[PDB]
Enzyme design. Structure first.
Site, PDB file in Angstrom:
ATOM      1  N   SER B 366       0.881  -1.133   0.000  1.00 22.08           N
ATOM      2  CA  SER B 366       0.000   0.000   0.000  1.00 22.08           C
ATOM      3  C   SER B 366       0.908   1.168   0.000  1.00 22.08           C
ATOM      4  O   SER B 366       1.849   1.201   0.785  1.00 22.08           O
ATOM      5  N   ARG B 367       0.634   2.186  -0.841  1.00 19.97           N
ATOM      6  CA  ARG B 367       1.482   3.350  -0.904  1.00 19.97           C
ATOM      7  C   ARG B 367       0.881   4.452  -0.083  1.00 19.97           C
ATOM      8  O   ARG B 367       1.492   5.502   0.086  1.00 19.97           O
ATOM      9  N   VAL B 368      -0.306   4.215   0.505  1.00 21.38           N
ATOM     10  CA  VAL B 368      -0.926   5.135   1.414  1.00 21.38           C
ATOM     11  C   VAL B 368      -0.823   4.425   2.719  1.00 21.38           C
ATOM     12  O   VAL B 368      -0.369   4.999   3.704  1.00 21.38           O
TER      13      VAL B 368
END
Lengths: 53, 499, 468, 470
Positions: B366-368
């Site tokens: 997940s980049r968030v």
């Protein structure tokens, strides 16, 4: 004395094996990459030939 | 009476006024009517044939306007009057679409009567800019322990559900929808995600299953199922996510929260391919239309966590991509992967090895991510990420004379893997996620026998509910684990382990 | 008075039929007044019979064949100036920062000729970079293209920010962060971060000027965003003399965008589906960027290699343009080192001995050899044991771990973020520092006295403080 | 307006364009008959090219044609005959009897194109067929009204499996069945006709609980495409107007995709991926969506699929893979292992195979089978170099069990008496769940590995244990 030498030899041998395998990974990686480009190109050519008609 | 309803319907027909622009079909083949007329046509405007078929006008050519039929070719025929509806593709948007299974046109395909809607808004509306957004800061819990901890899901953000074909991809998604019932039940609009499931190319049999499961879990009352079934034609299939997005935008515009699940863009891709190739538009890579990157990017950028000036709202999204032989290399996967912000990668081997959800932790990112993780859940699962990472590395060591350290990793790792199994279609509340993971983190589960892990889990939960549902209520409401709670929790786990 | 009626809108390729003897030239900008403000179309062919073929820069939604068109007369002319600093500007040269109309003196065409052979600077000179690691093992150069590699997860953004600060100190320059096909999500973060780090301080002064290209923007505008950014840079360089550094985001998305525009134009895509104009399109972008007599652009680019394939044509063409590569890595960041620069993978082609000075070259080579040996030593140091390896070897390990620590620099930009006062180290003093460590004059001083320090002078202080 | 007559203008292949006379406009998907020395050549109208020049696809072989040949229009889609007078007759694509029992007595006729029932109308329940074939029963039980799919590649004993399936499931279930052969060999055809006459399903006296629509690959590419569509309508008559549950069978549906790919090319459409039709998705979709359980009948398709070069990632099998409800994959490797059925246990999957559906006990037994086999597959690479004595002790027992389970899947077919000699064992569903459970529990881990091979249930295994004992 022998048994220790044998298990030691197996350790040494299996280390060298990993190295030989690594080299082959690299060699086939280049092959994979080349093949990958070629598939895209060859497929593209078929599409283009059709479009041209 | 059957007579009265029919009588109302006949009565509801009456008169008309000038048909602004007629057309006459020149040639109709392949659902590509090429029409002579429609001089002042707007781009992608909705046009109505004699047969009543509706179309869009993707090509506005220098003398013919290439309508694309939304209907079957059988009904349209050459020389037909082509009335100009004069309204660019727009779909009713409003609040009434909750619990309404509608097709792309907005016609209830479940016959739940005329849509109550507050606007009809265009489906080509362009996303909110750089400054109209404010960074993610609101979790969305999916009730899947692994998803919530290993790859935490925020709001307005997008992450793939990219994985192998028919691994019950829809099941992983459907679970999220179920968990939204708990938050939904609450009155706070903060706690209200109005989910929209966008069934693209999905067989009617599948949609029947979808409908029943959603009804069964009482989910319809915050659900919308935009349905473009397999039968539904390539214009509908093309415009189906676009249409769906507009519905989401209304909720987003009201500043509420919602989750729109596009499943699967792979069938969207195919539809654009069909349209373009049939309209003789330039073909491109992997025989997918040249502008397929542009299509996917347009859709996926609509999802946004709005700014406070725009009264912070969201439109969380979860695109689903079906990998063909697990090829992330493939053109449609590569594009989508680039566009999205995180991926969850379900893996067939794991499914076979009975891990369900079959999410492959390694290939999930997940980049968030942890930015929108519950604080409590964040605390009790930093350790978890590292342990599993080690378990992966020490996985191959599972073939005898194994170091005590490696063996320690293996015991802890195997038990964790077993713990993260979950029976699909049962979501698990965060207040019950937090205890289970705490135990695993404190390694008290290491002692518990592998076979007994399943029994342990339910027992621990019931034990916690009996022993101290005060703690649970505190966990739920405070949402931040105090040292006293972490103390008590450790004790509780120890006590439970003792029985 | 050059006006024409839209006579096709097949895709986003809009053919406009112009009245006689009033025919735009190729690369003109046409503006169609719309309820969307304007739609800017760029003439990319003449189809004859007083008709043209153009590409679009805004969405081509609800166009009616018969819309009045107005011809600007040449490439889109975007405002330039120090005024335009700290303004987020979209492709069409209009504020998307929403701080109102951009006050500007002159505007300049987005397409611009690349400086002549006469204007070329005979031999590249080093561009000082505050990051010590950059200045030792792979120096930047004025004019040059130095390609950052490794995405976010290395503190990429902070690195980009650090560079913005450094150039302003270094020369007095400015910067323009141009993001080509950047995710709108990432753009929000960058704006928020840049405001926070004060590099952009709207109230204050804003070093960096922003040009943000969202993925939603049509492929044509995705293609043109870079060239627009380049013009801004050229105004600073040529017409305000100031050396600047123009960042580009994924140059993969430059290529990708170019490929689409070609395909839209109906030009047969070449191998691996990359535009027939692949060489030329990079060529125009990457030769405008150069060392002029007036000033020099220097450009840091991010190369999102496609499927980690370096033999793909898009990387190959990119590598041709690149002069140096700075290879940020997450492993390095995991060794607690921010800079995240991987010393053994960072390489420059302007690392050349003659260029960088022989002494500097020799010092660098020793540090490289040391690091190269250190890595190899760490492999067997772990397995065999440290003390089970030579006195000479542990002298090297000892030396190395100090160098490894010495690389660390607490960045000026992240003075706010970490709370640690910044360190900006001048080029001469960078050379000096490594010379002393090579002669082991500070190879008494413990390893962690080198952790997160500045120059040689700085680690004198830390030795004292470590004791105290 | 003038009498509906067309003049051929171009025979370029199967695509034959006709030039109907002005102001009479033929319609998309009409059916043209051209009187020919060999019957009436049927051309399906598929595009209008304007000026009253249509472009139509041939359904019968095209030769000797003279540009200008008068073309009557019978209008709308090809109209078959339907009835229970179609039971026990082989019906060629245009509709003529090729069972040569003279004219089929038509009650009603129907078009070969019909729109699939709408979502509101379509009512589908989950009900379970009992196949009595052990691998199938445990690891992918079939369901009434489904879209069962016999995916397999080249020579997976595909016919043998089908013969067994018809023998068990078809005869067992009542209602009607419709046996449709799309583009298959006349060797296969002659056998299928003969076999179902032999099993008496095609009872030449008394009603036959099946109808036949044999389209063979000698027929033109065009004919191959719309043979499937033809068959579907026969099933629809059963589903709708006779109301009864239909046990449709189509063979081989890759031939349907393939046929469509060809006429796409001929229609002049720009070739899509791997040369398949750009309309592939919607065409596959149209066929499958039409096949369904309604509030009337329950059409249960069992569709054979041929997977070219055992690459199911190829877009044509992969596209079909989604649309089918209850997949069965037969794999070459498993065939070579001698396991008959050659169903690959890991890759066979059916929607119904959930504890809430097929029961917790069934589920648990099958879960134990699936995990055990998957572990065994994972360990094979390790076993290959390192050997058996380098794995865990638990693993060594699991491997022994897996080997016992692996050959328990070899349950003889009753129609493989003919091909070999092995007598089939029709093992009951309740019994099959029991039989697998015992092995896994280790209740018969004292019994040799080879005594699970080519025998039925646990009861058969015990008897076979005695056989080896002697």
């Amino acid at each position: 004395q022998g048994y220790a030498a044998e298990i030691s030899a197996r350790r040494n041998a299996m280390d060298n094996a990993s190295k030989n395998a690594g080299d082959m990974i690299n060699r086939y990686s280049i092959l994979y990459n080349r093949t990958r480009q070629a598939v895209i190109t060859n497929e593209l050519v078929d599409i283009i030939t059709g479009a041209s008609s | 009476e059957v007579s009265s309803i029919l009588e109302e319907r006949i009565k509801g027909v009456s008169d008309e006024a000038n048909l602004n622009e007629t057309g006459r079909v020149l040639a109709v083949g392949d659902g590509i009517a090429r029409v002579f007329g429609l001089n002042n046509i707007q781009a992608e405007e909705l046009v109505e044939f004699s047969s009543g078929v509706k179309g869009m006008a993707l090509n506005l050519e220098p003398g013919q306007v290439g309508i694309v039929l939304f209907g079957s070719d059988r009904l349209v025929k050459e020389g037909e009057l082509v009335k100009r509806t004069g309204n660019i593709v727009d779909v009713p948007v409003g609040p009434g679409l909750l619990g309404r299974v509608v097709d792309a046109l907005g016609n209830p395909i479940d016959g739940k009567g005329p849509i109550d809607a507050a606007g009809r808004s265009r489906a080509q509306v362009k996303a909110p800019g750089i400054l109209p957004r404010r960074s993610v800061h609101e979790p969305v819990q999916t009730g899947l322990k692994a998803v919530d901890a290993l790859v935490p899901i925020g709001r307005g953000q997008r992450e793939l559900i990219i994985g192998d074909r028919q691994t019950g991809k829809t099941a992983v998604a459907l679970d999220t929808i179920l968990n939204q019932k708990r938050w939904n039940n609450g009155s706070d609009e903060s706690k209200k995600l109005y989910c929209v499931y966008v069934a693209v190319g999905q067989k009617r049999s599948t949609v029947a299953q979808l409908v029943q499961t959603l009804e069964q879990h009482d989910a319809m009352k915050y659900s919308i199922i935009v349905a473009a079934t397999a039968s539904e034609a390539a214009p509908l299939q093309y415009l189906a996510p676009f249409t769906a997005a507009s519905i989401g935008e209304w909720f987003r515009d009201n500043g509420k929260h919602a989750l729109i699940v596009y499943d699967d863009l792979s069938k969207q891709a195919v539809a654009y391919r069909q349209l373009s190739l049939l309209l003789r538009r330039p073909p491109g890579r992997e025989a997918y239309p040249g502008d397929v990157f542009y299509l996917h990017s347009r859709l996926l950028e609509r999802a946004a966590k709005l700014s406070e000036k725009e009264g912070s709202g969201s439109l969380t999204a979860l695109p689903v991509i079906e990998t063909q032989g697990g090829d992330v290399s493939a053109y449609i996967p590569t594009n989508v992967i680039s566009i999205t912000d995180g991926q969850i990668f379900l893996e067939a081997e794991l499914f076979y090895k009975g891990i369900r959800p079959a999410i492959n932790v390694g290939l999930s990112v997940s980049r968030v991510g942890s930015a929108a993780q519950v604080k409590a859940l964040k605390q009790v699962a930093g350790s978890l990420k590292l342990f599993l990472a080690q378990y992966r590395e020490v996985a191959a060591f599972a073939q005898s004379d194994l170091d005590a350290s490696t063996k320690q990793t293996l015991v802890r790792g195997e038990r964790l893997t077993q713990l993260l199994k979950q029976n699909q279609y049962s979501p698990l509340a965060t207040e019950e996620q937090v205890p289970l993971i705490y135990a695993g983190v404190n390694g008290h589960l290491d002692g518990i026998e592998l076979s007994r892990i399943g029994e342990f889990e339910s027992s621990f939960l019931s034990y916690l509910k009996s022993n101290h549902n005060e703690l649970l209520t505190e966990i739920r409401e405070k949402g931040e684990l105090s040292k006293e709670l972490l103390a008590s929790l450790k004790s509780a786990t120890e006590s439970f382990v003792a029985t | 008075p050059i006006t024409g009626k839209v006579t096709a809108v097949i895709g986003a390729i809009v053919d406009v039929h112009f009245e006689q003897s009033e025919l735009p030239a190729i690369l003109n900008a046409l503006e169609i007044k719309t309820p969307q403000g304007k739609l800017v179309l760029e003439v990319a062919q003449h189809l004859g019979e007083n008709t043209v073929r153009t590409i679009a820069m805004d969405g081509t939604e609800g166009l009616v064949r018969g819309e009045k068109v107005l011809d600007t007369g040449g490439p889109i002319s975007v405002p330039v100036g120090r005024e335009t600093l700290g303004r987020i500007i979209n492709v069409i040269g209009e504020p998307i920062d929403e701080r109102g109309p951009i006050k500007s003196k002159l505007r300049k065409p987005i397409h611009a000729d690349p400086p002549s052979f006469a204007e070329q600077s005979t031999s590249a000179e080093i561009l000082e970079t505050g990051i010590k690691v950059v200045d030792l093992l792979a120096p930047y150069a004025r004019g040059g293209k130095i390609g950052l590699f490794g995405g976010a997860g290395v503190g990429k953004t902070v690195f980009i920010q650090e560079l913005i600060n450094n150039i302003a100190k270094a020369h007095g320059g400015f910067s323009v962060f141009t993001g080509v096909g950047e995710r709108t999500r990432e753009g929000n973060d960058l704006y928020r971060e840049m405001k926070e780090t004060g590099v952009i301080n709207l109230e204050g002064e804003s070093k960096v000027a922003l040009v943000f290209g969202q993925m939603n923007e049509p492929p044509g505008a995705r293609a043109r965003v870079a060239l627009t950014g380049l013009t801004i840079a050229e105004y600073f360089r040529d017409e305000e003399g100031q050396d600047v550094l123009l960042f580009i985001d994924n140059i993969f998305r430059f290529t990708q965008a170019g490929s689409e525009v070609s395909a839209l134009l109906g030009r047969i895509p070449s191998a691996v589906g990359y535009q027939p104009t692949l060489a030329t399109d990079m060529g125009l972008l990457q030769e405008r960027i150069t060392t002029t007599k007036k000033g020099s652009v220097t450009s840091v680019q991010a190369v999102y290699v496609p499927a980690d394939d370096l033999t793909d044509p898009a990387p190959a063409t990119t590598f041709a343009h690149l002069d140096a590569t700075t290879v940020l890595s997450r492993g390095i960041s995991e060794l607690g080192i921010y800079p995240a620069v991987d010393p053994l993978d960072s390489k420059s082609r302007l690392l050349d001995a003659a260029v960088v000075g022989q002494e500097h070259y020799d010092v660098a080579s020793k540090v490289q050899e040391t690091l190269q040996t250190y890595k190899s030593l760490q492999d067997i140091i772990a397995i065999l044991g440290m003390d089970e390896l030579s006195e000479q070897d542990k002298l090297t390990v000892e030396r190395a771990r100090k160098i490894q620590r010495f690389l660390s620099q607490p960045f000026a930009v992240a003075e706010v973020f970490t709370g640690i006062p910044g360190k900006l180290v001048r080029l001469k003093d960078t050379v000096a520092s490594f010379k002393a460590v090579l002669e082991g004059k500070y190879d008494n001083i413990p390893e962690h006295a080198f952790y997160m320090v500045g120059g040689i002078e700085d680690v004198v202080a830390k030795a004292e403080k470590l004791a105290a």
